[PDB]
Structures are given as structure tokens and as C-alpha cells.
Subunit: 385 residues, 4 copies
Amino acid sequence: YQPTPEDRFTFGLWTVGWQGRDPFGDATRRALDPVESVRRLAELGAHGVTFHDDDLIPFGSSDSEREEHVKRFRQALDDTGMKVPMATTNLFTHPVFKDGGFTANDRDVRRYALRKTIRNIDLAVELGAETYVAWGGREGAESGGAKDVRDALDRMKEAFDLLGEYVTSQGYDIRFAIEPKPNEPRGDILLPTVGHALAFIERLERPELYGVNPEVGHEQMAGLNFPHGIAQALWAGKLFHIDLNGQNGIKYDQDLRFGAGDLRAAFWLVDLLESAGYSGPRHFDFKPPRTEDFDGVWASAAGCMRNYLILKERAAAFRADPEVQEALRASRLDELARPTAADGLQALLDDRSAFEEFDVDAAAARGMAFERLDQLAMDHLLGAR
Amino acid sequence: YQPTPEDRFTFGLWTVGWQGRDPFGDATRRALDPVESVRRLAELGAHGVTFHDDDLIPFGSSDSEREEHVKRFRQALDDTGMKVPMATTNLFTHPVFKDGGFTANDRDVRRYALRKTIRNIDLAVELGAETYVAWGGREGAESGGAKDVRDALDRMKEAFDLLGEYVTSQGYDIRFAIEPKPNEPRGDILLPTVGHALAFIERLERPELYGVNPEVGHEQMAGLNFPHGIAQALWAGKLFHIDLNGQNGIKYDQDLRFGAGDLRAAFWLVDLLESAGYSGPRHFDFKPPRTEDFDGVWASAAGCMRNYLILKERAAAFRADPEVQEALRASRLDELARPTAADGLQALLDDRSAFEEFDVDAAAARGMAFERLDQLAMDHLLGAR
Amino acid sequence: YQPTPEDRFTFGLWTVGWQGRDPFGDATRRALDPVESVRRLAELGAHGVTFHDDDLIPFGSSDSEREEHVKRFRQALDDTGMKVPMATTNLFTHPVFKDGGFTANDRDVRRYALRKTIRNIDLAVELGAETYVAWGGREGAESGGAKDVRDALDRMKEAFDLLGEYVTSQGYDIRFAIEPKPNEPRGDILLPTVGHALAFIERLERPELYGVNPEVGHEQMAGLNFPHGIAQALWAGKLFHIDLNGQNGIKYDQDLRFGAGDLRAAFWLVDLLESAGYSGPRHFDFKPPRTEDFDGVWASAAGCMRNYLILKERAAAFRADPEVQEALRASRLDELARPTAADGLQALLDDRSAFEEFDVDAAAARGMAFERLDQLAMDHLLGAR
Amino acid sequence: YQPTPEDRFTFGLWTVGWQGRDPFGDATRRALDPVESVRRLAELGAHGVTFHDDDLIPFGSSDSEREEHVKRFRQALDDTGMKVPMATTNLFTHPVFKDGGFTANDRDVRRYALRKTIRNIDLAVELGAETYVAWGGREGAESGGAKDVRDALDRMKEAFDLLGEYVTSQGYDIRFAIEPKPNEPRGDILLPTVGHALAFIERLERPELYGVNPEVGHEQMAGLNFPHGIAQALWAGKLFHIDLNGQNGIKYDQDLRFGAGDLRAAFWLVDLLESAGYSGPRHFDFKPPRTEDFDGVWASAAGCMRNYLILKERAAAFRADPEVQEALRASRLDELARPTAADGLQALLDDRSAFEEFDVDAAAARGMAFERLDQLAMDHLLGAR
Ligand SMILES: [Mg+2]
Ligand SMILES: [Mg+2]
Ligand SMILES: [Mg+2]
Ligand SMILES: [Mg+2]
Ligand SMILES: [Mg+2]
Ligand SMILES: [Mg+2]
Ligand SMILES: [Mg+2]
Ligand SMILES: [Mg+2]
Ligand code: NA
Ligand code: NA
Ligand code: NA
Ligand code: NA
Ligand code: NA
Ligand code: NA
Ligand code: NA
Ligand code: NA
């Protein structure tokens, strides 16, 4: 289960670089130079890295310092063959963003947030990124009167519309991906799930430029089924990028390595991504636990990729097994894929077999055979066939 | 705090009529005749009632029995002045719907579900309903292989598109409202939140015919902020109807009387509905607990309306208080409502005050004053001003 | 992975016998004769069955009917070699128990609940049961004023103390096991977790007679770590019985087959039970989903046992692997098992290496190596070593 | 609603002193001198303050610096009349505690944790504290193999037993209070709820020295009913101290001001504490949100006390209202307080009215009248009587 760059595994600089500061504790690891992270990840078989502006260029750097930081990073990419498929903006760490970036109540902060974002879009394009992610982690509230959500959504739309005008006017081939999260660090975050983000996109001026970047753990913080949400995003044509990690239920955002947390959900996710032909990066937004030293950081990162590859093998074996294909027919998955009424409304209304002469009791007595199907799926996951 | 029909309070027949059967227990109350429910609710000051097909006409009734049930109900409405603003279909109780109605794997069940729905749309129009609700309580799965969600969403779209074709072809002035719920009775339900439902509507052939019917307790079963979700639905122009009740956090669907559960969320909800000018019914989808006899049923129903009226008074006093209006300005709610960049993209890019000369530290030092504002809101809610 | 009676797998009559009635739907399966359930479970390799009084003897049966029901059941046990290791009382279905049994506000109901329980203790002993379970599913409240919890705990203690007096006076070799659940069907249930039940037992007059019967899904309905709770019960000497099933997070009680839900938690549970030498029944309290016909019921029951046996194999391989044993030492699990200060308090106070000369920075720099250990555990679970 | 020192309101130095650093953001406020906090809290009407060792004496201070910090603090207490009723140890911030203090896998860390605690017990006694709190925030795990929970509980017991030996040998009149929390910062924390902590205490060598310090938000992070848990702690005689705050459901630990979060739970909590005669400090463990400047810090702290006083008034009015007293009898709260069977086991067995001649249907038909009672409670809370 050895990863190669062809597997498209990518990691944020902030993942393996997380120093271990949590709400109750100081850092347990030293800061990593981005150049070292690029080299170590390349050795593990990664395809590329991603960054927030402030991960690569320290906040407040002069133009000359910014140039030197980019030049060093560029050489590490050239030395390793690593790519940069996605970039994003840090609109959450600095105290100025304490009430948000795009939806801060203060108008001057909203304008600053846009200018900070635009500067990093230029850099992202220069480095070859195809997707620009926005995680509005400070957009929200702890109390009901602090934020009129209709006005906030107007400001959020205004911001994204301006960014779309910018990329169109510059001729850039980049697209945007909105990352939902339900809460943390704000008591409630705006656009809290994949669904809310998909709905918001349809009210933008150029909806074709915008998709979603769902994260495993974030949907699970609302107790939602992550594979189901991904299926809706795929159905809408909006899965532009994905963040892979693990989460144990409804609690703080754990950002465990992929495969940890809900293992069966991870299996169904990989099955769906591979069956649907998702061709984007397999990006890990995870935190090596602060119990670990640097050897544990790299072990945790390697485990992300290993678990994806094991699950890919098991899901492929499941779908290829003739006994599973038989079970899928026994459970009428084939009938689910056929139109209910391709004959049309009038034919349905005139069809006595659909109502007047429908034997509801005979239909009700048919078992769905879902438990046998699910035990075949369990046996395949566990390698017990 | 006496309700009158002008307050637009409505109740489902299945609410006060719930006999108290739960997963672990038999019924504790006898069945109520719908005519009795109409008369008792009218005496309490309700404006109207709502129904599933099977609440009003026992499943399997002949055409002659169906006529007699409707005639009796019609006379009770005429005797009381009660209205019927909304109706819905029961696609969840009968065993034939064990894998869903519109998204059942069996094609013959999907066709039956559509025919059952269409027959009740005709009745709803005859009785004067303006909104037709769909709660897809059996649409979903307990296991990952049982339901291909992309195919299921195709079938769900097909069903709603056919219903839109039907109402358009008949010339009916009714609109549809989709009611989300995240789980229960299925392990995961399709379209689990307001956001997912809003996103789905935008892929229908005639999106203008469809909105949402959010329920307080359902969004709270995902730990989401119900007022925030309602604000997004209002922002999209899609709040066609609402179900009011209470829920204590993430657990089974409790359907407590409105005002129970999260009281502060109820306050912020009423503030939003009244401030936005929502003009639809204030519908209660609640269950009097099975500990209660019939006197307790009517006390619980009266409490729904009383709590709405108290909260309406307190929210109005909050918004009218000059000290609150001052606090809203101190917290820059006025600035949130002003455009970020009505001067346009180029002016923003050329504005040195937005980036090059922006004093981030001075902006960061400004307190938001949200805690003082929230304590004024608490004082108003509690009548402690 | 074929079960045999030596594996001690047991099932409640109410599990495979669940007819599929849920809060929103009618039964999808016919009732099973208990004699048929005994015969089918014996064929699958089960060791025994368990029952509520009302599962075996229909409520309200005369003494002569009760005798015939027991006689038939007895012959099925004799014909199959099946045992009855545990029995319990239904104090939740009948409307009389709508406010509880042992903690109902009405005193006459509390006395009836005790008499109903005592009659079934006699029957349980006659059938050879060694454990008598109490699940107080109706003990609790939906609202704060309805139940003074201190008085309710006095009544709960009084009830359990009287039951202990009864079994002691009769000379019975049976012990009691309290089953916690946090909510459902009551809004909050008294003794909601393993911890609360363990604490309550210590205030009974004869604590040695009472232990816990934890259920996987119930602790998970509070978001708790089930293996951790089982470890505390084992540490206290109080794990008298266990209910095995699956649950997907914080929602209604799903009672999925064992191995479904949180698969990694199931692995760690089996590892703990087998390592600790738990010798009681491996009892499944599960519901075959109502989508299933009778063939699916038996497939789901077989899957419970199969998943336990697979996980047992994988946990044993994990603990026996020399590379895992090395990793456990690298993570200092050996040091966790050694006393902190067997030298005593005074020696600790005089030990300068414990404070004055302790190198906190060198200790802080040591990685715990937990991620490598956890990936070995993942590889073993998945059969990818 | 003006607080005075007689109300026993206390605050941790770390509450109003929280600088606003969260997992995703830097501090938004400067550090507060403990002397300033004492003076400002005294002006607001607080009774006293509490501290972790490291809040008062910077980690790593020499003995001479430690003396100066204590002397300054002592003078501020003398100048203001403020008391110090409780103290605690920081066993969570420094990287050395990344795997715990008392249950760290490394034995040398466990010994250091004990020595650090003992030094602060001496200081707590010198300052007049009557309760010593232990919050084991780092005791736990992110993964299953990292921590053998039985061994960890042995180490936890060993640590608390040694602390009890220390205070007994020194003749100190201090008692210990264990503070549960289910998760955060560890994936799962040992002793996750009030119940688990109460059960653990009963296995200590001197259980009389140990009680609980429950926190509103922590029990709510498991979805539990906080007033119910407090009632069990009172019933056991173990409520030594309490932490008051607010929390919106199952998510990260919010530490909102008291009265925020679940307002009705706050009402029932105050009703219980006042009715039971709890005489300990009313301690606030809260964080003024990082949106606030220093004026907002003091407004948030004042709001904690104001909300307690409003709720105290409303709960007292509820219990004193003759209509409520009538409703309590109608709901049989009086019967709940009477023994089930003071006549004894034999009399119960011989009482035909308890079983043979008990009219189960007549008893089942009696309504509990809980909804009317709960609406009276709502009306009192809202001041709408
Ligand atoms: Mg995350
Ligand atoms: Mg992410
Ligand atoms: Mg509901
Ligand atoms: Mg509803
Ligand atoms: Mg269960
Ligand atoms: Mg059970
Ligand atoms: Mg807290
Ligand atoms: Mg605390
Ligand atoms: Na746009
Ligand atoms: Na996960
Ligand atoms: Na349509
Ligand atoms: Na609620
Ligand atoms: Na006893
Ligand atoms: Na589970
Ligand atoms: Na002790
Ligand atoms: Na709260």
C-alpha cells in the first residue's frame, strides 16, 4: 500500500506543521520550515501541498521578505516535483478577524479581508493552484443579537461576487470552493453544512465559479452522514475539492488522521469517490496529535495515505464480487436507477397498476435484503471473505 | 396573552390527536374524532388545522366512506370558521413505505407513492390549502450499500418535477414545501437540513413552486441554530411554512410544545419571524406527552400559543427600547447592513485605506460590545428591565 | 467464523422477535412464537435466550395459560440445549407505567411494579437465570417540575433494597444488573450512564448483589467511549452482563447488529472483554431493521456473532504481534502499570528527582509514539499486516 | 438585582483573565494583573476568587519571586475583603502534561504532577481555601491502545489516596472536589461525567474527603440533564463545589456566562440549589468571548451574577405560589416523597391491592397533569403570571 504522486495525495502546510497549541495547552513541537515539509512529504509519496497565505509568508512581512519566502518555496517544489493544487486565506487567526472577515460588522475589516484574499489569489495562480478554498471560520456569532444573518448573507454574497469579478477580469483559471463547518471557533458558523453552502452558491452572480470543499469531520460535528453529503455535492456538480480526516462524533473538531474516527464512513466515502470518478486532489486536513514528536508526525501523515489505499482496495473488491452484484440486484439497487415514470404524467395517472389495482400487501411483504448486503460489505472491509 | 384567529395559529390533526404510542409503549389516550379536534381547537383560539390524508380518511376507505369523512369535516370547518391552510401525505406509516415512497428501491412503490400524493393534492385544493408539505421520513437508509444517493436524488427530483407538472396542468394555486429532518425513523434521511433542501430545490424544473417547511426540533437534532437556518430560508425567498415545537438537544425527535426546549432560540426565532414580516401560518407540529390525559392535551396546545404571544411581546419590547437601539449601533449592526464595496472592485483595489494604510491593530482593539447587548436581550426576555 | 454454544452468545426474545413498529410506522413482520425463536437461534449456534416477562407470557394471562406458555418454552429449551442466563421485567410498555415503575409518582403503581418484578424473579430462578436485569426506561421526565430527583432516587433505592431482601430471604443465587440509558422514551432517564449506575449501587443496602448491564448504543447516545466505561465497570468488579449492538452516534436508539455503528469501538471492546477474561454471556440487544423479512432477521442475528468472532481474532493477533508488544513499550504502557509511588508519601516528598531536579523540558520532548501504535491497530483490524 | 458578598459569588482568575487565545486565533486582550482582577471583582459585588497555581505564580518562578507574588495578592485580598474559597492545580498547560498528570504513561511525570499539586495545597491552606479542585483535563486518550483504562484508574486512585494521606498527616481542613468533563482537550477524558466521578470516589481509601465539582457546560457536552446530575450528587452528599456557566448543546466547551445557553436548565438548577440549601460558593467558570474588550469582560462577569439573582427570584416565586403548590399535588409530587412500602416486604407480598386486585386500567387512565405544571413554571420564569 505504497503511495505515489499519481494517487494525488496532498497535505496542508498547517497539518504536519501544527505545533500542538490547543485551547488548554502550549505548543509541544517546534515550528517546521515549509521547505522541510515539502521535502519530507515528497519522500512519503505525496503529490503536493496547500497553504494559507500566512503559513508561507509570515504576517506583516515586507515585500522583499515575501519575495524571499516565495523563492525558497518555489525551489523546494522544483527540487521535489511537488505541486500546489489549492491555496486559501487565513481570515481567522489575527485579532482583527475576531468578528469575521467577509461578514465582520465593521465595514473597514470587511474591505481589508477582501484585499488580503485578492493578494493571495494572485500568488496562488502564480504557483499553479486550480482551486481557491474559503473557510469562513470566524463568520458567525455566539449570541443572537450580534449578527443579523440576512445582512451577513448579503455581505457574504457581495464578497464572493467581487472575488468572481476579480478572477474573471484577470483571466484566471481558478475556481472557488467554500468549506462549511457548523461551529468552532464561533458558537455557530454561517453556512454550517454542505447543504447550506450549496444553496448559497446558487444565489451568487456566477454560480459556475463556485463549489464546495467538504471536510469529513465537519459534517460529522453535526451528526450528518458524510458520504450522503458528498453524493449530493457530486449530484449537483459541485465537488471541487475535499478535506479528508477523522472525527469521533459530535465534539470539538479533532482533525484525526484519515481512517481514524468513523471507519465504516471512510469505507463508504472511498467507494463513492472512486465509483464516481472524482479526479481532484485527495487532500488531508489533519493534525498529528500533540502527544507526538516529529517521528510521530510523519507516521501519522503516512497513515492517512495508507488508510485511503487499503480502503480503495476493499471497496473495489466489494464492487467486483459477483456475490455482491447478485445481492445488489436482490435489494433492487438496479430498480432505484430506473426512472419512476418515463412514460410520463398522463400514463401514470391512467395506470391502474399504480394505484387502483396495486397490491400494497404483497409489495409490503417483500424484504429488502439490506442486512445480508451490509454483512457482505463488512466482510469485504475486514478482509474476511 | 389570549390568541385569536388573526394570530394564524394552526395545528395538525395528528398533534392533539397523538394517542401516545412510542417505540417502547402502547397508546395512553383514545383516538380523537377529527370533528372534535376542530371544535376544541377553535374554542382555544386557533385559526386552522392541517392533515395528512390518512389522518382524515382511514387508509383503505372506499370512495363512499371517503365522501362521508370529508363531508363531516367540511361541516365542522363551516360551523367553526376554521381554515385548512396546509395538507400533506402520509408516506411513512404503512409497511409498503418501509424503504421510502419517492425513493423506494422498488419502482412500483414509487409509482404508488406518487398516485397517493396526487389524490390528496386534489383534496387539499378543494379544502382551500395554499401549501402542500412533503416530509420524506422514510427516504434514507440504515446502511451504506442500500441506497445509491445520486440515484435516489434523481428519483426525488423526478417525483417533485411530476408533482409540479400536475399542479401546473390543473391550474392549481398551491405551492410545495419540503420538510427536512436529519434522522428518525431512518438511520439517515435524505435532505437532512434546511440547507440541503434549499440546494435540492434549485435543481428542480420549476424551482419557483417549491420552498421549505423547517421544523424547530429537526434542525436542533443536528445541533444547528434554527434562527440562522430560518434567516437563510428567508434570504432565499423560500420560507413557505414553518413547524413550531421544542426539542432538548441532540436526541430522538421530542416534538415538545413550543417554548419548551431551547427557550432563547424560541425568542430569537419569534424576533426574526416578526421582524421579517413572515405572513404564513404559525403551525405547531407537537405531541402532548403520553403522561397526559385529554385535559393535558388541551393545556399543552394552549401553551404553544401562549408562549408564542409572550415571546412576541418581549421581542417587540427589545427592538423598541432606545437603550437596545443604542447598543445595536455600539456593536455596529448598522455597519453590517451597509455594502462592503458599493464603490466597486477597482475602487477597492485602489483604496490604500483598505490595505496598505489600514491600521490592523487599532481595528483589532475595538470591542464588539456583544455581551452587553446580549444581557439587554436576556433582561427583556425575562421581563427584568 | 462459525459460532458454537461455547462462545456464550445469547439473544433476547424481543430482538429477533421485533415486529418493526417504530414511532412513525406499523409492524412489517408477523409475531414470532418464542418456541420458533429458540429453535432457529439454536440452529445458528447461539448458547441461550433471555426474556422479559411479557415476551414469554402475554400480559394478563391467567395462571393456567401462564403454566402452558412456560411448559412449551421449557420443552423447546430441553429439545435444543439452549439456556436462559438472564431475565428481566417489562416495566415500560403498558400505559400504567407511563410515569415509571419504581419511581412513578403514584404510590400504587410503584407497589404494582415491585409485585410484577418479584413474580418474574421466581420464574427466572426456575429457568436457571443467574442475572436479573433492570432497565428503568420510564424512570425520568420530560419537564423539570414533574420529578424531584432526590425523592425519585430514594424510591429507586427503596425498590432495589426490597428486591435484595426478597432474593436473600428466598435463598436465591441470582444477582441484579442495572442497565443505564440516557434518554428515550423519557426526555431524560434516571441513572443515565454506567457511571451514574455504579455510583447509585454504592448507596444500596447490599451493594454486592448489584452490578451493571451496559449497552453499547446507550453510552454512545451520550457520546461516551464505551470501552472506557466498560473498563471502569470491570475495575469496580461490577460488569455482571453486557448488551452488544451498534449505534451511529448521538440520535435515537438504533439497536443495530453488533459490529455496525462504530466499528473501531467494537474492536476495542472485544479486545478489552477478552483480555480481562469476562466470562459472562455475550448478549445481543439488537433490532433487525424493519426493511427486512424473516430471512433478513436470521441473517442479521448471524452477523452479530460473526462480527464478534472476526474482531476477537483480530484483537488476539494484535496483542500477540511482537511488533505491537515493542510499540506498547515504546509508548510506555508498561510504565502506566507500575505504581507511581510504592516508596510512599514521605519518600516522594524527599525525592528531589521528582520536583527540584526534574528536567521538565527533557520529559516534555519525549514523543508518546501513539500514532504508530494506532496504525498497527488499524492494520490488524483490517487484516493489512 | 444587585449582588453583595453575602451571595457567595466567586470567579476564577483565569475567567475574567482569559486573553482570548482559542485553537484558531491569537489573544485579543492583554494579560490582567491578578491584583487588578481582585479589585474589579470586589467592586462588582463578588465574594471571592479562585486560582490555579500557575495563574498566580508564573510557571518556573524562583522562591523569592513566588513570595512577592503571594504577598501582593494577599494585600489585595486584605484591601478588598475578598476571600479565596477554592484553589486548584494547572496539570494541563505545560507540554510535560501532554499525556496527563496523574495518569501519564511516564512514571516520572506522574511523580512530578503529585509534587506540583502538594506544593499548591500548602498555599491554598495558607490563603484559607476550604476546597481543592482537580480537573484532569489531560487524563485520557485519542486512540484505544494508548491508555489501559484499568491501569489508569489504578494510577488515579493512587494519586488521590496519596493526596488524602498528605492532608490528613498535615492536619489540614481542606476537602477535594473532582471536576468531570467528557472530552476536550483529550479525545475522551477519564471520569467523563458526574456519575463516573461519584463512582470512582467510593473506591478511594478515605471517600469522606472527596466530592464533585460539576460544571454546567461539561455535563451538557454529553447531552445530560445538569439539574438531574446535581440532584444525584446532593443525594450522595457529595456536592462540595459547583462551576456555573452556559453551553449551547453538544460541541466544544463554550464557557458562556451563566444564564446563557440552556436558560430553562439554569432555572431548574437554581431552584434545586436554593431548595436543597446548598451553602457553598456560587463559582463562575466562564470565558468572556474574545470579541469583547475589557468593558465587555466586566459586563459579562456582572451578567453571571445578575442572571443567578433573577432566576433565584423566579424560582422562589414559583415554589411559593399557591396555584403551583396545588398543581404539584395534582401531579402527585407529594406521593413521590412517601415510601413505597414502609409496611415492609412481607406486607407488600400479602397486599392483594398491590397486584391481584389492582385496577391497572383505572391507574393508567389518570393523567399526570405535567404540562399544566410546566406551563406554570414557564409563566413564572418569564414573569407572565
Ligand atoms: Mg477540521
Ligand atoms: Mg478543512
Ligand atoms: Mg418532529
Ligand atoms: Mg413537522
Ligand atoms: Mg438500545
Ligand atoms: Mg439493552
Ligand atoms: Mg468548561
Ligand atoms: Mg470548570
Ligand atoms: Na459571482
Ligand atoms: Na470520521
Ligand atoms: Na419542478
Ligand atoms: Na427547542
Ligand atoms: Na440492597
Ligand atoms: Na456502535
Ligand atoms: Na483516599
Ligand atoms: Na447552558
